[PDB]
Amino acid sequence: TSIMAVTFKDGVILGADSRTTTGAYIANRVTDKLTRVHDKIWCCRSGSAADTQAIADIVQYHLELYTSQYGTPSTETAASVFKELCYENKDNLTAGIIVAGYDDKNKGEVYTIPLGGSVHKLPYAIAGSGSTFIYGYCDKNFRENMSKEETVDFIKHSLSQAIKWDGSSGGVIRMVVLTAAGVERLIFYPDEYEQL
Amino acid sequence: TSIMAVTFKDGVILGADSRTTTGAYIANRVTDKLTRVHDKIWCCRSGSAADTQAIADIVQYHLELYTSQYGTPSTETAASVFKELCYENKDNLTAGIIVAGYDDKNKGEVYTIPLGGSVHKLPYAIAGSGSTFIYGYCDKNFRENMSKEETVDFIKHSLSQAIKWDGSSGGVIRMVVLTAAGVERLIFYPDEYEQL
Amino acid sequence: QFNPYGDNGGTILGIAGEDFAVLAGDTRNITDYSINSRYEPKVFDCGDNIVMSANGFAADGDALVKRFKNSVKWYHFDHNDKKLSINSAARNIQHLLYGKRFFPYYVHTIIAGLDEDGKGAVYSFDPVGSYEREQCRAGGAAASLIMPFLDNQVNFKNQYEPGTNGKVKKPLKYLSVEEVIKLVRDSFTSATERHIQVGDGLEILIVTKDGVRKEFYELKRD
Amino acid sequence: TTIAGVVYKDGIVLGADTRATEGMVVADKNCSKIHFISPNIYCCGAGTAADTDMTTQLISSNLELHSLSTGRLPRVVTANRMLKQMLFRYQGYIGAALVLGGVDVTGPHLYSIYPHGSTDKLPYVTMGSGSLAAMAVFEDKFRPDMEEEEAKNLVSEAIAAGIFNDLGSGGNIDLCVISKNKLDFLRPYTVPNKKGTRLGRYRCEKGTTAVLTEKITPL
Amino acid sequence: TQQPIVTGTSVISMKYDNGVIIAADNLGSYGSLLRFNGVERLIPVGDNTVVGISGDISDMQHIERLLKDLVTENAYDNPLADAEEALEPSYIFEYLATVMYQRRSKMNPLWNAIIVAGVQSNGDQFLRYVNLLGVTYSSPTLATGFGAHMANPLLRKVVDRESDIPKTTVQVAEEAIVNAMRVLYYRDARSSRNFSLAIIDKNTGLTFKKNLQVENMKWDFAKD
Amino acid sequence: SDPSSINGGIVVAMTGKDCVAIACDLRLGSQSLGVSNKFEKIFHYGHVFLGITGLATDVTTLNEMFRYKTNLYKLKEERAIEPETFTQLVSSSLYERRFGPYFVGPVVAGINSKSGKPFIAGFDLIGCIDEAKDFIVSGTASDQLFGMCESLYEPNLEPEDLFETISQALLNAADRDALSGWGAVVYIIKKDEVVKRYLKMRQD
Amino acid sequence: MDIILGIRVQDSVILASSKAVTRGISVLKDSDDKTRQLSPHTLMSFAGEAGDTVQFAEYIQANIQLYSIREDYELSPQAVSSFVRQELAKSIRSRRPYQVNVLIGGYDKKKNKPELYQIDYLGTKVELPYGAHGYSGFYTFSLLDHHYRPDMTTEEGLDLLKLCVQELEKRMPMDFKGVIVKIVDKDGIRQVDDF
Amino acid sequence: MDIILGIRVQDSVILASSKAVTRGISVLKDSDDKTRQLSPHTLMSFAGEAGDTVQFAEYIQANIQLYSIREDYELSPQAVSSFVRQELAKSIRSRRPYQVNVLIGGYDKKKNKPELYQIDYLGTKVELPYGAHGYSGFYTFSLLDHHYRPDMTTEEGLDLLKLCVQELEKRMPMDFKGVIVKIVDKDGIRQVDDF
Amino acid sequence: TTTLAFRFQGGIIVAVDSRATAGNWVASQTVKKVIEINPFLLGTMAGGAADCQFWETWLGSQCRLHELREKERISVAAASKILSNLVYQYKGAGLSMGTMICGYTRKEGPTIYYVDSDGTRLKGDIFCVGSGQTFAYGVLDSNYKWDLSVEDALYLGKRSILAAAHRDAYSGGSVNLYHVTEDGWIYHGNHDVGELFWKVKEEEGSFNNVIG
């Protein structure tokens, strides 16, 4: 899987490939790995598909119940609920989740939750099997307070490389843009990103 | 280990980090992983230190005896001798070797020999544990027929990233330049490359 | 770890008549749940009026058949073009198989032909070369489905005469070549219906004093 | 097993073969694999056969009770959730691999559910030993918004690919067409193999078997 | 005993009325890493045979050298090396089949699956498979590894039995092969877009096509 | 070690014209040692017949269990259980031990008393229903029985024609299995009479 | 525990059970009675794992004796055997199963018939004319197949049993230190003190 | 093979060796002589793995008999035992070692002394007043520690040996079918036919 | 398998069953477990079918070379020891072989040697080898005496295999009988257990554990 979340001036953007594998067989080539846990809190999923879906469904439930009682939860609160599930059930789970959200107060925020169940707040984050190949590229090319078009290009180029080298990643590049303006879904096909 | 060989206009340049590990202990922090098998045929060594030294010594012997009888061997010939040893003794060896040399006829050439014992002639090559992190970066930034100063920078930036992310790599960045002009040894210290 | 053996499926059937013999086999070749070929012959004319099949692991089967064919060739050279009798061929095959006792040929072998009195013969071998002459033998994947039917219909087992109630056995009347071919085709139709590795085609080699004849029939392809 | 489904213009077409096996032996040649969940939702089933039967039946039963309480037709998402959450809880030990298809108030929906509790929501899916053979046919010939008779043919063609090329699959082709206006449960849709004809009669004549004793009791 | 390191995926093939077609992608995988993007896995032998190889790439390169060396050796003291005593597909196959089975029997196999495609002296189509165990078989369509599961079902719809071979033209057969290569790219996680294709025809000879690509790719249904 | 082949034995059932037949061998062993040659595997609950192969302690336990359940059924329903209903009861009961199963291969046989329709069925050890019209087989010589039944069987046989078919299927299949035989029983079941016959077979 | 035999004749059931109790390399005792009286006309012999054998026998004995007091009635041998089988069949799926095999020899006072039941640690019950557990059966069943008749007297049963014990002394590797023999008939249970 | 004993008295060595040959669950023979005469005044008893035992004994016998012909002379018991030990010590580091334990009882005609050597399959040699191999020694050594005296007669040696065999029959689990006894003295080797 | 051979007043009796198994699969019921080495030597076969058939056929070749080289019939002692010394060379390799070398010569009289694949070689008067040896031992040992006639000995051997054919799941098919005397061996027929069992039951009044 190749997934990433990147903060920028107007907010945050999540990105992902669309490949799901069973050994060498691509079980779903058009997978949607960007899932919505609240209006403007989304996550990227890597690891066991069953585990990450089960977690994401429970988080969605917790935040819906939080909203009923205490209003809109912060991105930090969403990350804490993901962490709590992942840490306490570390022996039975294989889940690597990036949490990304837009507040008006805090603006864009990215939290990564690797296998251990630890939490790390970062300007951007990369994860999944295909992320190994783009550490070098992403570190050299990331800047803070990029524009929307720059951040879309930074994610598109990065995942293009992750897809190129990782057999476990592939298909379309999906993105989800989180700003004050709302929620925008973007898709990019092989014919576009392969020629970069 | 992080190693690479890159062809350019005037010839070829080999590059390497200097770290040698025994588990977490850095047994040699100033290691020389670029070894000379002929006047203008060198190799980069990754894998078992004992295996790669034993191989490099045998190749050096074969090419010295080739030279005594048939004059200067081609870079292709050197690669074939490395391949022959690595392929036929694949069950007992852990060696990943890049072979790089300068002919006047052929100019710069790079051959990579991964674990299997297969041979692959390439414009440039990367290898070692730290190479995983720079596939994305190297693919995006490599051009053919670069100048010497561009290729030194391309190798310096690449291995700087490989060192940054891989714990198994580190120390100084050594390089060896192979052109018609001769053989030049370059070294770059942490204080120089870390701030890139 | 490397596993030198594999299973290519298939099923074979030998039946000895009074003055003839048949050796049949399905033409499907498989590995696991995949079909490799719908027509890969398995039963071979080896010369000297002997037909052979080595069903199981197809590589070991091909190797063995190849070695026996060569054994027939060198028997002619070394013994003044003498015809290799079916009993002698069988003993030669025992030694070929037992030669690899500690790294076996993963196959169940059957040869068919005529004995030196002109009567029909079928010999049957385990993987390490133990053998015996029989009148009837199925081998391979669906052998457990076919052999009981052949005990019942060829040797008239558990069959008695109506009216006597268990006292007088049904007499052991001889089967014609047309009668035997019906049993083979129906045995393979049954085995195809109930065994997943059996199907595609049936190839029968018939041995008489006049020589080796072939017949081919379609089998269900799923 | 070869099970498959497609989303077409008016709704859903589900497909399945009819071979049940034990070991390498065929126990049933005409075995039904398309299960009833609710009147507007059906489920094709592959994997461990008992697990497939009981898992569909339990979720069908619970949806019936759910639907009686709410008074409205159930949705595919709730069938999907109930199956998913159960299979996840049991960590793969309930070896059910389903193709879930139905038509809601919200339109037609098709899912694939895996033994570990993962689900994919897709316009076409295939599962079982014969899923690759069947998926090859869909990658070759599928397009979105097909007409009914075209979609029927594509699914039938995909199951056939499994029947012939996969040894795990065989027998007849069953379809289930689901739209807003109708439900068409076609069993069998096609009989691609004739039953082999036997050339002899091997049945024994009366008094051929040897008996020791006999008893008769009326009812 | 070893384990394969750098690997090649599916080789697919079929017969048609006048000859045979064979194809294979240009990738050398290193586990999940798509390491080498310029690897040729169809290796021609003379002007009447193409050997398509999947599995371990170092063992492929070894086999490539054996075949190269076989051509050299057949030329020795052979005035008819480019005519009646040229190497045949059936000769080249039987050699490889002998080698493969010998190596498995010494518990040191060549970790490959091979398809030999060609046309014989008398115009007959030759198409046969051999693998690391020495197992051999022939069929109107043949495919290794992943292609056995996805390519064969599609190719068999064009040539289901022997009697369909004369009815199949080179255009129909080539379309089917290229169609199958697209399907494998969608669905095989260890495949690539770039491939090579080879036609060996009894009239037009050996045509070797490099740098082909999978095209007409349906991804539009993803956005929903 | 393998619980399904410690004790050994077989059951087969067939349909005919207005009749069904079910049959079983009489062996009980401890692997190679033959112990009993009077261990019947066919039981009945009213007009519904149940054959059970596999681990003998479970064969006995399940018989006792289904007697229990069908007795309470009859008391509450005020009628005997039918084959279709009993089949579902067997399936339920086996599946409730999904992760610690009874090591058995049950076979239902009977005639529905209301419709008059002949009925047979079979199950795996966790209760999946094989629901075939022609024949059902079970035991250590199941492969052998499958082959015999597929070549001998034909539809709509009269009771005494069917007797010969099922008997020859059982006997010839058992004689190719080390852990089956030692005697055999055949029930011919009609809508209102049942004929039970013991077969003469080789005692090795 | 090693050898336990049983044989049902015309009017009685005879149980023979070895006297040796071995642990490792030492024979700790050569006079061990591997039986318990469950009721006046029902006797159970037993063999299997150390501890489990006696613990199981005494537990069954206690329950049948409780039944006898409560109802002022002796359960039939058929009933006792069915109770024992259920206990073993319950046991086999426990945390720690009873590793005990048993023979139940009883005289049914209602039917005026001797009855012999063989039950293993799995709960596998069979009524037999003669039975054995463990390796003994491999020798003794073929003898009894040859020599047994249903209408034999108790003395003929004891002679046939001597022939079984001689064959076991000749051909078995372990010294089982002879057998204690007990007869179960209409008059109850008695021990043959010279064998 | 199971029990082999040896005891050296005043003027002789006495070797007792069991008669049973068991394979699995069946005692195949009850009259097996587990000894070979190496020379007229030297006897070797043996026990260990099937096949290896006899093969080793007969091989040693052949070599000593060859020495006897070549030199027209009988090797001392000390010499024969040293030859045997070396063969076993060579064996233990082979591809497939001989799994055989031995006792060598001899009368040295030069020194006019009986001698008993105990050697195991590793090549561990010891001269002893009394010896045993396998489990027998666990019972028999404590007896002999109590009752043995160096100046005993051959009849006293045989009584002391009966007391060893009775204790083994009482306390060992396996029926070894009694022992064949042989005396090695100045007049050669003879078998005690009633024991 | 069940093979027995025993010595008595009027020679040697040898009897064997005729079943071959591959697990619980009955592979054949018409198998020859007695090899006729010459007119005075028999070999029985138990264990691996190939191992027996091969090395006992080979034994017959080595017995022929002895009588060519030495102008004299090979002794039973010598014939048995060729086979025992052979299997001992293959010890640990996994040969499975349990056999009985039965024969007559003037030098030794009637003689039986037990030889097995782990090197054991034993002379004796009675042996039973196979999966069904215990069942045969039971009947044989309890009806044996030197006294026996040739008619009674032949029957007792026939009956001791029947006994094991019945109880042992891996023995059966038919009983092949041999009588060895000073003049050589004599075949005494193939007796199918299918018919023999019911005949022996009726005539002897035994096997009362059975329904029939």
Ligand SMILES: *C[C@@](C)(O)[C@](*)(O)[C@H](Cc1ccccc1)NC(=O)[C@H](Cc1ccc(OC)cc1)NC(=O)[C@H](C)NC(=O)CN1CCOCC1
């Ligand atoms: C790089 C990639 C594509 O693997 C990325 O990490 C995927 C993330 C993803 C996929 C779909 C939806 C959301 C997120 N992961 C997968 O594709 C996983 C790979 C995976 C499997 C198993 C484990 O650890 C136990 C980790 C990662 N694919 C699956 O989960 C598929 C659907 N199911 C299986 O492979 C079945 N296996 C059987 C063995 O037991 C585990 C599940």
Ligand SMILES: *C[C@@](C)(O)[C@](*)(O)[C@H](Cc1ccccc1)NC(=O)[C@H](Cc1ccc(OC)cc1)NC(=O)[C@H](C)NC(=O)CN1CCOCC1
């Ligand atoms: C990334 C790095 C630094 O590991 C790179 O690949 C090194 C290449 C190198 C180092 C020195 C000179 C030339 C080239 N490799 C090492 O530092 C190796 C790591 C390694 C060890 C073992 C194996 O495979 C068996 C592969 C890689 N370090 C060593 O070889 C050191 C000197 N020795 C040991 O770690 C001792 N071990 C003990 C266990 O048996 C293997 C050797």
Ligand SMILES: *C[C@@](C)(O)[C@](*)(O)[C@H](Cc1ccccc1)NC(=O)[C@H](Cc1ccc(OC)cc1)NC(=O)[C@H](C)NC(=O)CN1CCOCC1
């Ligand atoms: C291609 C095929 C035939 O496998 C397809 O998936 C079948 C789907 C099906 C659905 C409903 C009714 C009938 C058939 N599945 C089967 O036929 C399964 C195949 C199978 C066997 C074994 C295992 O083990 C994990 C999985 C799948 N057949 C069965 O389930 C049969 C009836 N029962 C058994 O094989 C008994 N085993 C015992 C061990 O536990 C699993 C059940």
Ligand SMILES: *C[C@@](C)(O)[C@](*)(O)[C@H](Cc1ccccc1)NC(=O)[C@H](Cc1ccc(OC)cc1)NC(=O)[C@H](C)NC(=O)CN1CCOCC1
């Ligand atoms: C009662 C029985 C069956 O045990 C008796 O001993 C048979 C004696 C016999 C003698 C001559 C000809 C035929 C039969 N033995 C068999 O039938 C053997 C039993 C057996 C199988 C396997 C082994 O393995 C060490 C030992 C004994 N059956 C066979 O030999 C069968 C027909 N063949 C195989 O099992 C083939 N395998 C292949 C691998 O190598 C071992 C033999």
Ligand SMILES: [Mg+2]
């Ligand atoms: Mg990719």
Ligand SMILES: [Mg+2]
């Ligand atoms: Mg089929």
Ligand SMILES: [Mg+2]
């Ligand atoms: Mg069903």
Ligand SMILES: [Mg+2]
């Ligand atoms: Mg039988």
Ligand SMILES: [Mg+2]
């Ligand atoms: Mg038997």
